[PDB]
Write a protein that binds this ligand. Structure first.
Ligand SMILES: [K+]
Ligand SMILES: [K+]
Ligand SMILES: [K+]
Ligand SMILES: [Mg+2]
Ligand SMILES: [Mg+2]
Ligand SMILES: [Mg+2]
Ligand SMILES: [Mg+2]
Ligand SMILES: [Mg+2]
Ligand SMILES: [Mg+2]
Ligand SMILES: [Mg+2]
Ligand SMILES: [Mg+2]
Ligand SMILES: [Mg+2]
Ligand SMILES: [Mg+2]
Ligand SMILES: [Mg+2]
Ligand SMILES: [Mg+2]
Ligand SMILES: [Mg+2]
Ligand SMILES: [Mg+2]
Ligand SMILES: [Mg+2]
Ligand SMILES: [Mg+2]
Ligand SMILES: [Mg+2]
Ligand SMILES: [Mg+2]
Ligand SMILES: [Mg+2]
Ligand SMILES: [Mg+2]
Ligand SMILES: [Mg+2]
Ligand SMILES: [Mg+2]
Ligand SMILES: [Mg+2]
Ligand SMILES: [Mg+2]
Ligand SMILES: [Mg+2]
Ligand SMILES: [Mg+2]
Ligand SMILES: [Mg+2]
Ligand SMILES: [Mg+2]
Ligand SMILES: [Mg+2]
Ligand SMILES: [Mg+2]
Ligand SMILES: [Mg+2]
Ligand SMILES: [Mg+2]
Lengths: 98, 63, 138
RNA sequence: CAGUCGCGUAAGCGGGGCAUAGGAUCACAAGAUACAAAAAGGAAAGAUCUUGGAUUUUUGGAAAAGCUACGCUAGGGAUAACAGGCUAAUUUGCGCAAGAGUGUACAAAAUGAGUGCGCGGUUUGGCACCUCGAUGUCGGCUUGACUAAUCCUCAUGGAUG
RNA sequence: CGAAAAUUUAACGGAUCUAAAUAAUAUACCGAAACCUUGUCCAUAUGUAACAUUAGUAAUAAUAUUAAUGUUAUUUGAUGGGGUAGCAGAACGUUGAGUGAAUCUUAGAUUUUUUUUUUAUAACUAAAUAUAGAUGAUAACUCAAGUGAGAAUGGU
RNA sequence: UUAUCGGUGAGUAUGUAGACUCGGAAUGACAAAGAUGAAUCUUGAAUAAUCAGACAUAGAAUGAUAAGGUUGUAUGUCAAAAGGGAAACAGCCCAGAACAAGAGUUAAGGUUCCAAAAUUAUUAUUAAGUGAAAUAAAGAAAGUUUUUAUA
RNA sequence: AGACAACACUGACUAGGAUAGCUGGUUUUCUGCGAAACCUAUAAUAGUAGGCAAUUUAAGUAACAUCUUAGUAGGUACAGA
RNA sequence: AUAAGCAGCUCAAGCAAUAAGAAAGCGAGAGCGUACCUUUUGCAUAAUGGGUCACCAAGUUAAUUUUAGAUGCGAGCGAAU
């Protein structure tokens, strides 16, 4: 190609700090909504699905926070900053073994 | 820059370190001798009349 | 309790369905605070925009006049003395000094009613040729 | 729903086919309708309903062959004659890895099948962002500048061969 | 190390860096016309009060009120604010016309300028130069258009 | 007579998949009730422009698993969107510009100097300026560190 | 020799009578809203028509959007043989 | 007269009134900013157009057929005696 989209393949230590803090901020929203309902003895299907199949920032591996699964990459991994609107989208789980 | 507001930010100089130690609780009077030339209205203690009652110790010796 | 939701991020590039979730919550612009009861209907509404908002449990809902009174800065001044002014719909309010406290507003169809010094008053002060200050005060 | 027929003990079923692959109007023609009838009585020519003949097959439905290098005008440059741009299938462009084999002996002095991993932008191509000096896209002359994958000159390792 | 191309270092932007590199973390700070706060302008509302105009209705020999329009303020501490094609609303300006046998002008009407002020495609203040009594200029409302030009290889 | 050739029967044996799907998501779709919301919907009357779109991400067809190629689908941006970041930048990352003021609060992104803000703390690796905002590959090797074994 | 017939000749000059789905241009300000490059038909694909649908402002709304809860249609990713 | 500005904008030293009062203008120096229009998916584009300025220069009129608003009359209206 000729149109230059200068996107580095890896993130900087400053972007990683904000990715860590963005994952840790979505945990407080799900922990606030999950505890607010438990006091009322209530539950939601989407709040129970999240806690089941999604990990917290303290349970994620570094490669799951800064990378995603791309079948067209050599090692099936791609920088998470390559995902559209990656800053306002949730992406924590990748296919097993990849 | 484009706007006057953008120029004020590029030309900013922070206040002195002394003013940035704001008290969390209550009011405190602090000693902040400035790094500047004193005027002629700061009469030295040697030029004050014996009658004058304002001849205090150095402010260093009041802390 | 209630959910205190504040739109921290925008949705300029997110799908159209995400705008329908922020429209039902009432978040029009950025950093706008809304209060919604703690209920499953709202809780699933926040699981769709949980990457843009900040949720907080609060005991009571805040009114419109109370959400704005927590960001209102102190005036930093107090009017202690006012000078004579003419209020169009009320009348001519005289001078008042709030240090010794009296907004007396005299209205009428004659200059005497307004409470101001008229030409006749200046003729009575000009004919008092006997008034003299005491020698001790002079 | 009305009309009136078939089958069935009855309930009931029947407005073709187990489902999915057959075009109007106009004109023209054959029946019915009793609407109007250019003075009037009739009629002609019209109107409604039913139906027929269509590679109406460019099947929402023209009776229809070419040339212009002498071409004209209005335009677009959907790339068309060029160059630049992207790509690298191919190449008369190369490198590296591996080593079947040749070398009387002995893989790597030399040589190197069919292959793998690559660089590069010269040949023949692909694309079409882009209208412009072209179909041998190139030759000669003048004058260069640069590259190094070296024909000559300079230094040098290997070579039972 | 493999890693070779033709203007020039030539895809760290550059200086430079032994971290000012890399990997796993933590905090403060900076940071947009975004957000907040204090004001302003504009659009659309909602009630109230007051001012003016017009037109009615009452009172008055010893002014009050109703409706429309314009306007300011204020209540809800009201809501809203990019924009091509395109659609819609509201205005200004230019030329001519009626009211006009009107108003104003040597105590300076009018002067392509300069200057001042006002939320201002506009008018206004003052100054300087010249000298007009109407074949001069003109508010307000209204009427009709040969009515608004940095763009047509436009024309003079 | 064959661990030869083909064929048949058996296998709860191994693989293969656009026209195999017994199993089977998420997503999206339809409709009901309640709640919330910025009127965003329908109708009546009046009446437009537009009909080569481009790129990005995912997943395909096509090409040669080439193209800033061609062609569907999902989502967004540009088109018609200024501002901050990506050195410069239609399409990417943030964020939707009515006008001002403020060491105001933040996003993306950054904080030695150019250039606003850390030469800020902790633990390791690298010695090649590797690298530091656009990863050249297979491969080689007493480079070096750690771990697991080991004399 | 498609040669010449008075600037012009693959049929001159002059006067009278055109069209152009194509190109270019279309002039003051403020305010509100705000698209599409898709489908169908077309001797049509540089056009046009009808839709979808932008605008104006009236009448309606059990309107429309989103979520929650229960239900329904349908066989992709995956997985399997 | 040491400098690589679509000549504007943001910051701004200094100069500038013989005199009481009164600073328009020019501006060193620092930063930001790649003309306009047309046509296009997209133009600083090396795509189209313009040497400058002034003037001329484009949704108008007629008939006809509609709609909205306002207003006259009203089961009549308009026209005309
Ligand atoms: K000839
Ligand atoms: K808008
Ligand atoms: K005109
Ligand atoms: Mg390029
Ligand atoms: Mg938008
Ligand atoms: Mg007859
Ligand atoms: Mg007859
Ligand atoms: Mg057809
Ligand atoms: Mg059809
Ligand atoms: Mg093209
Ligand atoms: Mg041998
Ligand atoms: Mg040699
Ligand atoms: Mg030798
Ligand atoms: Mg460099
Ligand atoms: Mg704003
Ligand atoms: Mg806005
Ligand atoms: Mg607007
Ligand atoms: Mg004058
Ligand atoms: Mg012109
Ligand atoms: Mg393309
Ligand atoms: Mg366009
Ligand atoms: Mg932009
Ligand atoms: Mg930088
Ligand atoms: Mg600060
Ligand atoms: Mg600094
Ligand atoms: Mg380097
Ligand atoms: Mg579109
Ligand atoms: Mg056409
Ligand atoms: Mg099944
Ligand atoms: Mg100099
Ligand atoms: Mg083009
Ligand atoms: Mg040029
Ligand atoms: Mg040009
Ligand atoms: Mg020109
Ligand atoms: Mg004109």
């Amino acid at each position: 190609g000729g149109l230059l989209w200068k996107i580095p393949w890896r993130m900087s230590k400053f972007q990683k700090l904000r990715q860590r803090r963005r994952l840790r901020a979505v945990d407080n929203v799900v922990a606030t909504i999950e505890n607010a309902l438990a006091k009322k003895g209530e539950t939601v299907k989407a709040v129970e699905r999240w806690r089941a199949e999604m990990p917290t920032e303290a349970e994620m591996l570094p490669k799951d926070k800064y990378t995603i699964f791309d079948r067209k990459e050599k090692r099936y991994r791609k920088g998470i900053h390559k995902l559209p609107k990656w800053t306002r989208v949730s992406q924590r789980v990748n296919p097993p073994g990849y | 820059q484009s706007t006057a507001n953008r120029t004020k930010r590029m030309l900013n100089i922070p206040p002195h370190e002394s003013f940035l130690n704001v008290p969390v609780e209550g009011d405190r009077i602090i000693f902040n001798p400035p790094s500047s030339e004193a005027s002629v209205y700061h009469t030295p203690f040697k030029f004050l009349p014996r009658s004058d009652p304002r001849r205090r110790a150095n402010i260093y010796k009041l802390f | 309790s209630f959910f205190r939701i504040t739109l921290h991020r925008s949705a300029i590039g997110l799908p159209k369905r995400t705008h329908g979730v922020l429209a039902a919550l009432g978040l029009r612009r950025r950093n706008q605070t809304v209060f919604h009861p703690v209920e499953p209907q709202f809780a699933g509404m926040l699981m769709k925009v949980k990457e843009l908002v900040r949720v907080e449990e609060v005991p009571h809902r805040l009114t419109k006049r109370e959400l704005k009174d927590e960001r209102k800065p102190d005036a930093g001044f107090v009017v202690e003395k006012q000078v004579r002014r003419f209020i169009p719909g009320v009348g001519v309010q005289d001078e008042v000094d709030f240090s010794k406290v009296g907004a007396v507003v005299r209205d009428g169809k004659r200059a005497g009613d307004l409470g101001v010094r008229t030409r006749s008053d200046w003729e009575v002060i000009g004919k008092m040729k006997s008034v003299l200050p005491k020698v001790k005060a002079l």
